[PDB]
Design a protein around this motif. Structure first.
Motif, mmCIF file in Angstrom:
data_model
loop_
_atom_site.group_PDB
_atom_site.id
_atom_site.type_symbol
_atom_site.label_atom_id
_atom_site.label_comp_id
_atom_site.label_asym_id
_atom_site.label_seq_id
_atom_site.Cartn_x
_atom_site.Cartn_y
_atom_site.Cartn_z
ATOM 1 N N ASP A 33 -3.008 38.814 -15.750
ATOM 2 C CA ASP A 33 -4.767 39.324 -15.567
ATOM 3 C C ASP A 33 -5.105 39.034 -16.263
ATOM 4 O O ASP A 33 -5.180 39.638 -17.276
ATOM 5 C CB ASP A 33 -4.294 41.207 -15.189
ATOM 6 C CG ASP A 33 -5.417 42.294 -15.213
ATOM 7 O OD1 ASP A 33 -6.755 41.293 -14.997
ATOM 8 O OD2 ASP A 33 -5.670 43.250 -14.900
ATOM 9 N N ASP A 35 -9.062 38.419 -18.352
ATOM 10 C CA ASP A 35 -9.593 39.651 -18.865
ATOM 11 C C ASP A 35 -10.475 39.871 -20.056
ATOM 12 O O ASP A 35 -10.490 39.827 -21.084
ATOM 13 C CB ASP A 35 -8.749 40.565 -19.168
ATOM 14 C CG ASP A 35 -8.984 42.195 -19.563
ATOM 15 O OD1 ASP A 35 -10.989 42.157 -19.158
ATOM 16 O OD2 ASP A 35 -8.614 43.077 -20.281
ATOM 17 N N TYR A 79 -6.954 51.187 -22.919
ATOM 18 C CA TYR A 79 -7.812 51.240 -22.082
ATOM 19 C C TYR A 79 -8.725 51.121 -20.951
ATOM 20 O O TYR A 79 -8.201 53.126 -21.597
ATOM 21 C CB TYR A 79 -6.886 49.756 -20.765
ATOM 22 C CG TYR A 79 -6.257 48.207 -21.459
ATOM 23 C CD1 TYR A 79 -7.403 47.352 -22.350
ATOM 24 C CD2 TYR A 79 -5.342 47.910 -21.819
ATOM 25 C CE1 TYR A 79 -6.623 45.865 -22.285
ATOM 26 C CE2 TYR A 79 -4.108 47.473 -21.668
ATOM 27 C CZ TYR A 79 -5.380 46.212 -22.247
ATOM 28 O OH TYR A 79 -4.297 45.204 -22.581
ATOM 29 N N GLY A 80 -9.414 50.995 -21.131
ATOM 30 C CA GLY A 80 -11.340 51.716 -20.244
ATOM 31 C C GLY A 80 -10.119 53.546 -19.117
ATOM 32 O O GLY A 80 -11.275 54.397 -18.817
ATOM 33 N N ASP A 81 -9.446 52.875 -18.087
ATOM 34 C CA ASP A 81 -8.788 53.235 -17.078
ATOM 35 C C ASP A 81 -7.601 54.262 -17.653
ATOM 36 O O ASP A 81 -7.602 55.398 -17.747
ATOM 37 C CB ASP A 81 -8.244 53.002 -16.736
ATOM 38 C CG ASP A 81 -6.970 52.195 -16.898
ATOM 39 O OD1 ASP A 81 -6.811 51.747 -18.061
ATOM 40 O OD2 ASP A 81 -6.118 51.502 -15.703
ATOM 41 N N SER A 83 -4.953 53.661 -19.799
ATOM 42 C CA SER A 83 -3.891 53.035 -19.632
ATOM 43 C C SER A 83 -3.556 52.436 -21.000
ATOM 44 O O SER A 83 -4.714 52.058 -21.878
ATOM 45 C CB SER A 83 -3.785 51.621 -18.351
ATOM 46 O OG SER A 83 -4.114 50.804 -18.814
ATOM 47 N N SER A 115 0.405 53.411 -15.188
ATOM 48 C CA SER A 115 -0.393 52.002 -14.620
ATOM 49 C C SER A 115 -0.013 50.951 -14.609
ATOM 50 O O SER A 115 -0.259 50.525 -13.580
ATOM 51 C CB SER A 115 -1.881 52.690 -14.358
ATOM 52 O OG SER A 115 -2.362 53.833 -14.154
ATOM 53 N N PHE A 116 0.518 50.501 -15.110
ATOM 54 C CA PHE A 116 1.047 49.449 -15.566
ATOM 55 C C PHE A 116 2.628 48.603 -14.653
ATOM 56 O O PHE A 116 2.830 48.591 -13.777
ATOM 57 C CB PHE A 116 1.184 49.108 -16.980
ATOM 58 C CG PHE A 116 -0.099 48.896 -17.535
ATOM 59 C CD1 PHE A 116 -0.702 47.366 -17.155
ATOM 60 C CD2 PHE A 116 -0.222 49.082 -19.021
ATOM 61 C CE1 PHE A 116 -1.750 47.319 -17.655
ATOM 62 C CE2 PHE A 116 -1.423 49.233 -19.564
ATOM 63 C CZ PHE A 116 -2.546 47.818 -18.674
ATOM 64 N N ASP A 119 2.235 48.748 -11.013
ATOM 65 C CA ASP A 119 1.497 47.658 -10.812
ATOM 66 C C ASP A 119 2.722 46.695 -10.555
ATOM 67 O O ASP A 119 2.442 45.843 -11.479
ATOM 68 C CB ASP A 119 0.435 47.643 -11.700
ATOM 69 C CG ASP A 119 -1.258 47.003 -11.114
ATOM 70 O OD1 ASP A 119 -0.859 46.110 -9.915
ATOM 71 O OD2 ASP A 119 -1.954 47.981 -11.459
ATOM 72 N N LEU A 125 -1.691 40.950 -19.660
ATOM 73 C CA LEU A 125 -2.688 40.063 -19.601
ATOM 74 C C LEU A 125 -2.943 39.500 -20.490
ATOM 75 O O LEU A 125 -2.421 39.405 -21.522
ATOM 76 C CB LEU A 125 -3.758 41.898 -20.158
ATOM 77 C CG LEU A 125 -3.887 42.925 -19.122
ATOM 78 C CD1 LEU A 125 -5.204 42.399 -18.947
ATOM 79 C CD2 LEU A 125 -2.204 43.495 -18.401
ATOM 80 N N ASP A 219 -17.051 41.786 -17.328
ATOM 81 C CA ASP A 219 -15.546 41.748 -17.701
ATOM 82 C C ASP A 219 -14.741 41.214 -16.772
ATOM 83 O O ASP A 219 -14.701 42.278 -14.827
ATOM 84 C CB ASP A 219 -15.681 43.514 -18.235
ATOM 85 C CG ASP A 219 -13.783 43.671 -18.213
ATOM 86 O OD1 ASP A 219 -12.784 43.027 -18.049
ATOM 87 O OD2 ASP A 219 -13.581 45.117 -18.287
ATOM 88 N N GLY A 221 -11.473 42.171 -16.016
ATOM 89 C CA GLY A 221 -10.604 42.703 -16.132
ATOM 90 C C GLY A 221 -11.078 44.489 -15.537
ATOM 91 O O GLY A 221 -10.354 45.264 -15.201
ATOM 92 N N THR A 222 -12.094 44.671 -15.265
ATOM 93 C CA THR A 222 -12.565 45.590 -14.569
ATOM 94 C C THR A 222 -12.852 45.641 -12.858
ATOM 95 O O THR A 222 -13.706 44.712 -12.608
ATOM 96 C CB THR A 222 -13.588 46.141 -15.748
ATOM 97 O OG1 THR A 222 -13.027 46.542 -17.214
ATOM 98 C CG2 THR A 222 -14.337 47.605 -14.965
ATOM 99 N N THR A 223 -12.383 46.620 -12.239
ATOM 100 C CA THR A 223 -12.210 46.698 -11.271
ATOM 101 C C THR A 223 -14.050 46.437 -10.163
ATOM 102 O O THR A 223 -14.090 45.367 -9.334
ATOM 103 C CB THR A 223 -11.877 46.975 -10.152
ATOM 104 O OG1 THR A 223 -10.377 47.148 -10.270
ATOM 105 C CG2 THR A 223 -11.910 46.875 -8.267
#
Ligand code: D6D
Length: 330
Positions: A33, A35, A79-81, A83, A115-116, A119, A125, A219, A221-223
């Motif tokens: 990913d 990012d 990370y921001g979520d 994870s 979360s990783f 996935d 990353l 970013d 790496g952010t959806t």
């Protein structure tokens, strides 16, 4: 030198994009990913806690003749979520789309968060923010781009993300066939280690453009697109039945709706995000409530121009001595 690699959505919603990366000798290809909001290259590995690996391709440094332990180095990131992952570090040869860096820090995960693990399509990353954010201790490491930069024809990379389709990451050159019109460049602050810039405003659908400074980061790496609550409210007010749900975790809208476009300013230029790009589908299978692709940044601390915004543009990450960001329509 240059490199060019195709990046592919991991699912039908474009939740993330994966790009094949060759690590080690002989090559071990992992799908990473890319990012631009972080600065660690880390991978699922032969060292990752077994119960935390579920379908990912792993890097096995003992099978690489060019791998070397970076003795004493460890890493740990969140990370921001919410994870996270952590582990130790090898140096090895890393290639992206024909561009090769020797002695790249490859951070081997010993632990990854749920979360990783869940996935299965993401093997790790590849960070493309500024190396000042790299978490390796006690000796901070450089990103793939940072390492490649001097060898590149031009110290740039570009992100050309597709909507429900593959796209392209290029290193070292700007593909003038990949966009329409001109590229508008805008100033970057590296003070927080991000590709941080200031948008000049926004419009909702066919509405008038609101001139207002919106500081945020580019970013990959952010959806989603995370913007101030005022802006986000103005957008969803144009969708009948749309509302913010604390139970769901953001704005949802009737799946029967037709979404308006969203325009953001880059200097005097305008990037138009089609309404379809803002649809992230039923909140759960079969639901008639759909999750919105524009969400409030209020609980984040920073505005984020994530994939929803970036995929509407051809984006140049200019890593010259004074970094800048370029946006073109496509
Ligand atoms: N912005 C980060 C994101 O929050 C992380 N999440 C972990 C699972 C996928 C994704 C959810 O969107 C991922 O790692 C770094 C970067 O992308």
């Amino acid at each position: 030198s240059t490199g060019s690699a195709t990046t592919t959505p991991i699912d039908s919603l474009d939740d993330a994009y994966i790009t094949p990366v060759q690590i080690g000798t002989p090559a071990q290809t992992l799908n990473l990913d890319f990012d631009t909001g972080s600065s660690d290259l880390w991978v699922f590995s032969s060292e990752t806690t077994a119960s935390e690996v579920d379908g990912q391709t792993i890097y096995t440094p003992s099978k690489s003749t060019t791998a070397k332990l970076l003795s004493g180095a460890t890493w740990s990131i969140s990370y921001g979520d919410g994870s996270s992952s952590s582990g130790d570090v090898y140096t090895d040869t890393v290639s992206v789309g024909g561009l090769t860096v020797t002695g790249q820090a490859v951070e081997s995960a010993k632990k990854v968060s749920s979360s990783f693990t869940e996935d299965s399509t993401i093997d790790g990353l590849l960070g493309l923010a500024f190396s000042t954010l790299n978490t390796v201790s006690p000796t901070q490491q450089k990103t793939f781009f940072d390492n490649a930069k001097a060898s590149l024809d031009s110290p740039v990379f570009t992100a050309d993300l597709g909507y429900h389709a593959p796209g392209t990451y290029n290193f070292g050159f700007i593909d003038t066939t990949a966009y329409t019109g001109s590229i508008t460049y805008t100033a970057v602050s590296t003070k927080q280690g991000f590709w941080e810039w200031t948008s000049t405003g926004y419009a909702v659908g066919s509405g008038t453009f609101k001139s207002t400074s919106i500081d945020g980061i580019a970013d990959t790496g952010t959806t989603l697109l995370y913007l101030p609550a005022t802006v986000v409210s103005a957008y969803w007010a144009q969708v009948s039945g749309a509302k913010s749900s604390s139970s769901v975790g953001g704005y949802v809208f009737p799946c029967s709706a037709t979404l308006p476009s969203f325009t953001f300013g880059v200097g005097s230029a305008r990037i138009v995000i089609p309404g379809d790009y803002i649809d992230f589908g039923p909140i759960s299978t079969g639901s008639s409530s759909c999750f919105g692709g524009i969400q409030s940044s209020a609980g984040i601390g920073i505005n984020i121009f994530g994939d929803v915004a970036l995929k509407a543009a051809f984006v140049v990450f200019n890593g010259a001595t004074t970094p800048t960001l370029g946006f073109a329509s496509k």
